[PDB]
mmCIF file with all atom_site columns, C-alpha atoms in Angstrom:
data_model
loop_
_atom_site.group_PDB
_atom_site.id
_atom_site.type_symbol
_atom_site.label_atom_id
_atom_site.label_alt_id
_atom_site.label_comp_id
_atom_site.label_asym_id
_atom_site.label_entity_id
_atom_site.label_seq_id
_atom_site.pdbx_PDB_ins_code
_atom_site.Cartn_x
_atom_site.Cartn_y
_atom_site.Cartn_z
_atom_site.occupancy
_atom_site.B_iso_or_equiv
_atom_site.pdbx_formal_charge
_atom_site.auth_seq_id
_atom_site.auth_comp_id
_atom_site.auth_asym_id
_atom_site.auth_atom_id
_atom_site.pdbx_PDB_model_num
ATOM 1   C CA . UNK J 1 1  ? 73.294  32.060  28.079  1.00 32.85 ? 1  UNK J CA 1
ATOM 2   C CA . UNK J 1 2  ? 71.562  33.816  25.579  1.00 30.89 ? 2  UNK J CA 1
ATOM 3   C CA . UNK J 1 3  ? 70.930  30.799  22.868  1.00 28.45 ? 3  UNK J CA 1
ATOM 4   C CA . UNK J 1 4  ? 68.552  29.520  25.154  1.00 25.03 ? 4  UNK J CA 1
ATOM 5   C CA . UNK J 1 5  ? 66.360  32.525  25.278  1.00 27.29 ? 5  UNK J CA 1
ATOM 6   C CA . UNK J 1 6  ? 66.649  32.218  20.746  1.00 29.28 ? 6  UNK J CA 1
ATOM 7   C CA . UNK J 1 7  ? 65.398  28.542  20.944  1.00 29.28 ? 7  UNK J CA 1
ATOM 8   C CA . UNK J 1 8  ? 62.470  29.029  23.455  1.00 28.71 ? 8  UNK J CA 1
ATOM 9   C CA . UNK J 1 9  ? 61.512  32.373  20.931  1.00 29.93 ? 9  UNK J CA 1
ATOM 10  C CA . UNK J 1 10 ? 61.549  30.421  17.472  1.00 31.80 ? 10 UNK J CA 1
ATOM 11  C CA . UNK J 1 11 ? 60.417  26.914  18.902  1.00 30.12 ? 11 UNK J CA 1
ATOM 12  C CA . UNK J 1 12 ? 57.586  29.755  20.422  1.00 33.78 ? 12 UNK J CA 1
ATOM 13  C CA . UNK J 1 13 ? 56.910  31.088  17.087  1.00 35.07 ? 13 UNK J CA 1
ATOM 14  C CA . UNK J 1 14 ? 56.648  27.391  15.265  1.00 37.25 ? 14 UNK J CA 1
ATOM 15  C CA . UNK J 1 15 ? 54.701  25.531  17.925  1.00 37.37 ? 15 UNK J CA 1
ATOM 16  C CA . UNK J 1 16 ? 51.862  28.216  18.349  1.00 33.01 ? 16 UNK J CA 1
ATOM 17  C CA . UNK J 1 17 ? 52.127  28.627  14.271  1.00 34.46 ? 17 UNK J CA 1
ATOM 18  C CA . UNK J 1 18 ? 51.840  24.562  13.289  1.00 34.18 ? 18 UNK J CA 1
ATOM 19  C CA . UNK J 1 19 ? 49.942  23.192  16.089  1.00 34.66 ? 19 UNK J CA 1
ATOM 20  C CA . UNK J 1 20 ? 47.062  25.435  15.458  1.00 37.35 ? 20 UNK J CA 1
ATOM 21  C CA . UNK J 1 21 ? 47.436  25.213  11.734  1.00 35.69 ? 21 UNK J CA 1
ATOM 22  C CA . UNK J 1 22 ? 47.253  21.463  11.753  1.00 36.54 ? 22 UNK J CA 1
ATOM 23  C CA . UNK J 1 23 ? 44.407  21.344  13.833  1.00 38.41 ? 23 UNK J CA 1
ATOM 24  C CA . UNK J 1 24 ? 42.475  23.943  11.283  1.00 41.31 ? 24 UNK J CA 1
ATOM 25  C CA . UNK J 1 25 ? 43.147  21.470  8.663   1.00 38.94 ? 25 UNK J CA 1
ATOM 26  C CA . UNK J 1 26 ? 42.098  18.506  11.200  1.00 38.89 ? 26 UNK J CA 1
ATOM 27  C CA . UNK J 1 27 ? 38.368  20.689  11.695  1.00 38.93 ? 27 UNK J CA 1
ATOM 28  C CA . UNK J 1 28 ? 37.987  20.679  8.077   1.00 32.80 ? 28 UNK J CA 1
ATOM 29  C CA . UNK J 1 29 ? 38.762  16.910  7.769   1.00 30.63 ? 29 UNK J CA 1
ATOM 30  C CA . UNK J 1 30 ? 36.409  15.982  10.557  1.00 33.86 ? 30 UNK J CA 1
ATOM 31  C CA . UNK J 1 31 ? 33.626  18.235  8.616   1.00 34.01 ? 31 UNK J CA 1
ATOM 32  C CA . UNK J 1 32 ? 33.893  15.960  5.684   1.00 32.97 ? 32 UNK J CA 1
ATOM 33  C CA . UNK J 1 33 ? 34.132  13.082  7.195   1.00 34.71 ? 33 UNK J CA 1
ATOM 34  C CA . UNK J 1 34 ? 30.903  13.774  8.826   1.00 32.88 ? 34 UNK J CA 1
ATOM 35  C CA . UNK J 1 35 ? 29.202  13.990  5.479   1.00 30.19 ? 35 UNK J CA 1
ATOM 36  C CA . UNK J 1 36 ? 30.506  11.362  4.149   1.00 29.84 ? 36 UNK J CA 1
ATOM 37  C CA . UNK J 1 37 ? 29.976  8.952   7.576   1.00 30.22 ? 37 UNK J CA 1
ATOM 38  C CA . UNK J 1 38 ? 26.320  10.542  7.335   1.00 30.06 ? 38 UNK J CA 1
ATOM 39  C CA . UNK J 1 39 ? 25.527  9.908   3.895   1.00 29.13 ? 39 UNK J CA 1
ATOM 40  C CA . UNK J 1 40 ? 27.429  6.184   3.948   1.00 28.65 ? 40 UNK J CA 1
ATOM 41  C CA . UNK J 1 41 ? 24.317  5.775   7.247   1.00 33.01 ? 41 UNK J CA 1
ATOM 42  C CA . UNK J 1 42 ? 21.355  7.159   5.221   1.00 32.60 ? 42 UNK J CA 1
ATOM 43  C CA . UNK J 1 43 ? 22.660  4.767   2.456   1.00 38.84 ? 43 UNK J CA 1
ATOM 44  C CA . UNK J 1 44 ? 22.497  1.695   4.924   1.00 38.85 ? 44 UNK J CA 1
ATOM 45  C CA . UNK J 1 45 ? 19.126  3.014   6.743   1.00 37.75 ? 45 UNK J CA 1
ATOM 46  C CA . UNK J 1 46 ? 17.694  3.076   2.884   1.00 39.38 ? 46 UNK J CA 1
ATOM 47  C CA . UNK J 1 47 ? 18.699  -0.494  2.371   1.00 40.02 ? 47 UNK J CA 1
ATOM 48  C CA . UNK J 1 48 ? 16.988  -1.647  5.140   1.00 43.17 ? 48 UNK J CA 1
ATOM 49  C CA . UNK J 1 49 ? 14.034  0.829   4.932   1.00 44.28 ? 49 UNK J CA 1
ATOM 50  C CA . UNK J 1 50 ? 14.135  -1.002  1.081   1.00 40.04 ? 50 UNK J CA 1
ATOM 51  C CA . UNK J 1 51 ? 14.372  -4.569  2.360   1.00 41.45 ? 51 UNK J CA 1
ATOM 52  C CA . UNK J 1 52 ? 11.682  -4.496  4.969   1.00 42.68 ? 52 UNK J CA 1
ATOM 53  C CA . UNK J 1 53 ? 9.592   -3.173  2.086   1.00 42.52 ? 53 UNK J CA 1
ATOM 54  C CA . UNK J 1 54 ? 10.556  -5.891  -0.544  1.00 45.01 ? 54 UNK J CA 1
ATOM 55  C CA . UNK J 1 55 ? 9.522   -8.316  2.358   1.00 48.43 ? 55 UNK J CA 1
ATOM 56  C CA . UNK J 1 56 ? 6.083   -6.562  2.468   1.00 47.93 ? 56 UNK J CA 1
ATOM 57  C CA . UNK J 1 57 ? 5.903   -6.901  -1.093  1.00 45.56 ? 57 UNK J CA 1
ATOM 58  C CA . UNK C 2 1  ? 5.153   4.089   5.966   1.00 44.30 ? 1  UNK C CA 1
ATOM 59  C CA . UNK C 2 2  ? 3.673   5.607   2.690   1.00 43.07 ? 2  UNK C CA 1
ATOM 60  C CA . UNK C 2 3  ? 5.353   2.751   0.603   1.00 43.98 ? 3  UNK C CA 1
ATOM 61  C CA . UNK C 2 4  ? 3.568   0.149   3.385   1.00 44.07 ? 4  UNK C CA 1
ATOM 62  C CA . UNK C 2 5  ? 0.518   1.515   3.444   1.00 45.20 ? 5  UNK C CA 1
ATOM 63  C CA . UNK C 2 6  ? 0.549   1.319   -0.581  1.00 44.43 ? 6  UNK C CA 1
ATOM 64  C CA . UNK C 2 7  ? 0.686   -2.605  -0.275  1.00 45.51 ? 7  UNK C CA 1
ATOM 65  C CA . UNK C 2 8  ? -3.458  -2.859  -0.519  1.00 47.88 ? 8  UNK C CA 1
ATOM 66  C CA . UNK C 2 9  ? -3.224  -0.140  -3.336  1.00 49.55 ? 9  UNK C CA 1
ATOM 67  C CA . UNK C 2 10 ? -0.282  -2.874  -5.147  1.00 50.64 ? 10 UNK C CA 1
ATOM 68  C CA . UNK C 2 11 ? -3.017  -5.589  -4.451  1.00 49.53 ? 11 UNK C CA 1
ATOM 69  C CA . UNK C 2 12 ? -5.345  -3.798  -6.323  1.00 48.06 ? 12 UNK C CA 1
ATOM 70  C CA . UNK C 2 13 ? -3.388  -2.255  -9.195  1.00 53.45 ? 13 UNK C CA 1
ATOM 71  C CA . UNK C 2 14 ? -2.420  -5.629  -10.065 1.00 53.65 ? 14 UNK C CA 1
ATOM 72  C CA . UNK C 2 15 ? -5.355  -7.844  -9.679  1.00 58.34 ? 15 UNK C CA 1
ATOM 73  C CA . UNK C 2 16 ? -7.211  -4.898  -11.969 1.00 58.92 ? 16 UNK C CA 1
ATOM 74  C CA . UNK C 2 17 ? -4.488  -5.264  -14.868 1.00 58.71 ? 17 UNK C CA 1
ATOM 75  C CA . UNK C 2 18 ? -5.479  -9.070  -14.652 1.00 62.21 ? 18 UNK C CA 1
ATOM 76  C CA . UNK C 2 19 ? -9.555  -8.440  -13.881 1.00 61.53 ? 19 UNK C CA 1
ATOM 77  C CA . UNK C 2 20 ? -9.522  -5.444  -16.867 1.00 61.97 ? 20 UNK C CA 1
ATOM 78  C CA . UNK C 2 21 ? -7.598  -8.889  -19.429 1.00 59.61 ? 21 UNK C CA 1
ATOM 79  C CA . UNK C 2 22 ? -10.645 -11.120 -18.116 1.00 56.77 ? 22 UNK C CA 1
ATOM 80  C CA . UNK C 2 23 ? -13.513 -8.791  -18.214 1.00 56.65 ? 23 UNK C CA 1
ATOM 81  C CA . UNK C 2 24 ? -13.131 -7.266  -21.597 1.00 54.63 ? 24 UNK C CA 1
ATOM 82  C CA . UNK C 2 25 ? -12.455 -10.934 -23.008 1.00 56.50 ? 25 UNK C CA 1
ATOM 83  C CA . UNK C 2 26 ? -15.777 -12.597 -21.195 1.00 57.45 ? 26 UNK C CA 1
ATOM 84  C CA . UNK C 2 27 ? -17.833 -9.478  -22.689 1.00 59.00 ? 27 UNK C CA 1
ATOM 85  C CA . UNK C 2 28 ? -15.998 -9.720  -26.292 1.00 57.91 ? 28 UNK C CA 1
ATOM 86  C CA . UNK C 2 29 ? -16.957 -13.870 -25.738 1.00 56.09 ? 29 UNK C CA 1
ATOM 87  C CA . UNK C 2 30 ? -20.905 -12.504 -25.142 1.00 57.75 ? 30 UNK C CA 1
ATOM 88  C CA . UNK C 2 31 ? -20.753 -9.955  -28.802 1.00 57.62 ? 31 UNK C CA 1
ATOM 89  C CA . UNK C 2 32 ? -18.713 -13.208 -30.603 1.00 56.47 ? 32 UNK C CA 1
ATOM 90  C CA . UNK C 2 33 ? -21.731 -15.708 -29.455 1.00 57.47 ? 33 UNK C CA 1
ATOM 91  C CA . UNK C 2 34 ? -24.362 -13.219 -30.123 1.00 57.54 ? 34 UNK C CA 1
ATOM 92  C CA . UNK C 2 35 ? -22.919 -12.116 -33.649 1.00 60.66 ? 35 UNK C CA 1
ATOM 93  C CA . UNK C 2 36 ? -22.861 -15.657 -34.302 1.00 56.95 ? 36 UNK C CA 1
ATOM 94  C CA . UNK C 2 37 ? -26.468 -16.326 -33.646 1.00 55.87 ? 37 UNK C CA 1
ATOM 95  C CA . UNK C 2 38 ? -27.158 -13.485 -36.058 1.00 57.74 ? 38 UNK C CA 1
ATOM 96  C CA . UNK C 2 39 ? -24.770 -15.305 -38.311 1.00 56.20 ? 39 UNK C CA 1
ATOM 97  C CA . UNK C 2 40 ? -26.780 -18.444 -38.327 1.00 57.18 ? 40 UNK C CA 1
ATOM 98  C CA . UNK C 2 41 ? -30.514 -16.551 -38.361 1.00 59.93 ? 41 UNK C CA 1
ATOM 99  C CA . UNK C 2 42 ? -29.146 -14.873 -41.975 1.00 61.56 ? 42 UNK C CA 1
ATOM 100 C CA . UNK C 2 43 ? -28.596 -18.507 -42.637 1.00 62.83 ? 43 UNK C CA 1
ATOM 101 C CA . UNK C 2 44 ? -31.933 -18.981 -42.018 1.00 61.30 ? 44 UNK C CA 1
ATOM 102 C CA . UNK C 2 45 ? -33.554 -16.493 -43.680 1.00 59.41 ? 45 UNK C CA 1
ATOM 103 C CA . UNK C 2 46 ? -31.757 -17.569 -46.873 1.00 56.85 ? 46 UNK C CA 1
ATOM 104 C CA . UNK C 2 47 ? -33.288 -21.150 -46.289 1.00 55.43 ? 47 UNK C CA 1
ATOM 105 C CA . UNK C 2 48 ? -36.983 -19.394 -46.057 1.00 54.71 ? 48 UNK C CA 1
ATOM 106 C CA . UNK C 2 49 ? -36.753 -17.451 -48.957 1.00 53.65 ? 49 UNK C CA 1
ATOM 107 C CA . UNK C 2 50 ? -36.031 -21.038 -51.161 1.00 51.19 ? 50 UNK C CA 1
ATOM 108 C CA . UNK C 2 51 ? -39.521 -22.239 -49.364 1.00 50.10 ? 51 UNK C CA 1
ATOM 109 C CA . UNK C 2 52 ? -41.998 -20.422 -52.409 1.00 50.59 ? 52 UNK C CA 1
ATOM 110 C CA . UNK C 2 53 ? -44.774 -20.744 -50.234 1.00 50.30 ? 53 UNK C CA 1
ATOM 111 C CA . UNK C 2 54 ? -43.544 -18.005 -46.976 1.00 53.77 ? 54 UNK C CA 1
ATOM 112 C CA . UNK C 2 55 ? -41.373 -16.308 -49.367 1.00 51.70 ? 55 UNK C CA 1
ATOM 113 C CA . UNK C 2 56 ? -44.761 -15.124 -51.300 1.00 53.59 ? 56 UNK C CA 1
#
């Protein structure tokens, strides 16, 4: 009987503690990434933006 | 856009380097030429004063 009722309480406990946790660590991941994706763009839109103006040159 | 609109301003920058080269050597061609005239006239004038006659 009662075992069931301790295994829905800890697996309670560690699902609502990890899942959360790992996506806080996931949201600061995805904020880096975006920096880095954004900067790795600018880079490439500077290389062209520097190509089309060796090509005027 | 800055950059493309700077292409006349290139133009320009670099045919002055070469134009500022070719004008001051034409004008330092026109003092050489002239200097040499006055070269040769004091040439001259030491030939007239061996001529007695206009050097009285």
């Amino acid at each position: 009987s009662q075992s069931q009722g301790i295994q829905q309480l800890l697996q309670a406990e560690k699902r609502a503690a990890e899942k959360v946790s790992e996506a806080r660590k996931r949201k600061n991941r995805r904020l880096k990434q975006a920096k880095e994706e954004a900067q790795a763009e600018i880079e490439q839109y500077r290389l062209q933006r520097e190509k089309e103006f060796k090509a005027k040159e | 856009e800055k950059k493309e609109k700077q292409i006349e301003q290139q133009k320009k920058i670099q045919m002055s380097n070469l134009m500022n080269q070719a004008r001051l050597k034409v004008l330092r061609a026109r003092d050489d030429l002239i200097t040499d005239l006055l070269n040769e006239a004091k040439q001259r004038l030491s030939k007239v004063v061996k001529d007695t006659t206009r050097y009285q």
